[PDB]
Design a protein around this ligand. Structure first.
Ligand SMILES: [K+]
Length: 290
DNA sequence: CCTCTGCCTCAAGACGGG
DNA sequence: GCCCGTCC
DNA sequence: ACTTTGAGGCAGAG
């Protein structure tokens, strides 16, 4: 994520956030970070202090969450493509099992060379999907034209679906993508440190005036705002600006009919899900394809 | 105003019966 | 609708 | 990660 970026946009560029009804997204395609969704299911889907599992002790919380959340999206007319991270722990077995489930459900997935969010952003840039459905605002820093929050949130949570439009953010802040990347570094990114004493108000002001972190460092008073030693801001800038990403043209994205017979063998025979519940889910999925 | 830091509170997936 | 036990 | 974890809201110092 980017520390304080969503709050900043709401505070200073609220017109960049559009809130629309779920019905308005019927038929839209979205990219989703599979690795993060697996991680979240391992945390959320718990019983008695442990993940759901079959009698052999093999985890199934990830399968449970992926199976029903995907069906709910398709019931809303939203077609997801899942993006797996490239180069509580998400294991290779978790990924392989979720990929197997997705293939049997007829849901496309892709392997990112590196960051899943950056490859999600690349898919939106190429027009392959409408938006990245994520809470990670760094997807904007990777250049995603549209980010959508709370798309999969249950109705009970009463969280409105929010579209963040990158072009509007840049227009309101008066910045280009390169300057926006430097601003996100000053706000606080996973890749490198931020300058102590420089928060969201001063970072926006300094980026608008000086236009680059390099220029900012020269202008700043070293005594008042010392930078961290061996600051990797040039490296982080490059990771956001030119990330290693998949080729959106490489793989054709297709949503196909689920394979109920194989889903029963895998989810019920092996993973010991209730057959009644799996068949009910498959029927909802088939109905949503209409 | 602005940015910390420390203290605090509470959500964290989906389903289905009542 | 919500509450809350259960899912595996 | 619910016999825990962590993100965010708040108040006040500097
Ligand atoms: K800082």
């Amino acid at each position: 994520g980017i520390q304080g970026l969503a709050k900043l946009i709401a505070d200073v560029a609220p017109s960049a956030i559009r809130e629309n009804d779920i019905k308005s997204y019927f038929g839209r395609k979205v990219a989703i970070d599979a690795s993060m969704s697996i991680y979240q299911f391992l945390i959320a889907v718990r019983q008695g202090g442990d993940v759901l599992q079959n009698e052999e002790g093999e985890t199934t919380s990830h399968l449970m969450g992926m199976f029903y959340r995907t069906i709910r999206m398709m019931e809303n007319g939203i077609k997801p493509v899942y993006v797996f991270d490239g180069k509580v722990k998400v294991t290779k077995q978790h990924n392989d099992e979720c990929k197997h489930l997705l293939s049997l459900m007829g849901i496309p997935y892709l392997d990112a060379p590196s960051e899943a969010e950056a490859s999600c952003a690349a898919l939106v840039k190429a027009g392959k999907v409408y938006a990245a459905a994520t809470e990670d605002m760094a997807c904007l820093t990777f250049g995603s034209p549209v980010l959508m929050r709370h798309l999969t949130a249950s109705e009970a949570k009463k969280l409105p679906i929010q579209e963040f439009h990158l072009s509007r953010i840049l227009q309101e802040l008066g910045l280009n993508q390169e300057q926006f990347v430097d601003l996100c570094i000053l706000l606080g990114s996973d890749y490198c440190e931020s300058i102590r004493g420089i928060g969201p108000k001063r970072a926006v002001d300094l980026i608008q005036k000086h236009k680059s972190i390099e220029e900012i460092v020269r202008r700043l008073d070293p005594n008042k705002y010392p930078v961290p030693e061996n600051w990797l801001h040039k490296e982080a800038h490059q990771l956001f600006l030119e990330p290693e990403v998949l080729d959106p043209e490489s793989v054709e994205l297709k949503w196909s009919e689920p394979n109920e017979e194989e889903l029963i063998k895998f989810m019920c025979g092996e993973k010991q899900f209730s057959e009644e519940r799996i068949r009910s889910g498959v029927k909802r999925l088939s109905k949503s394809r209409q």
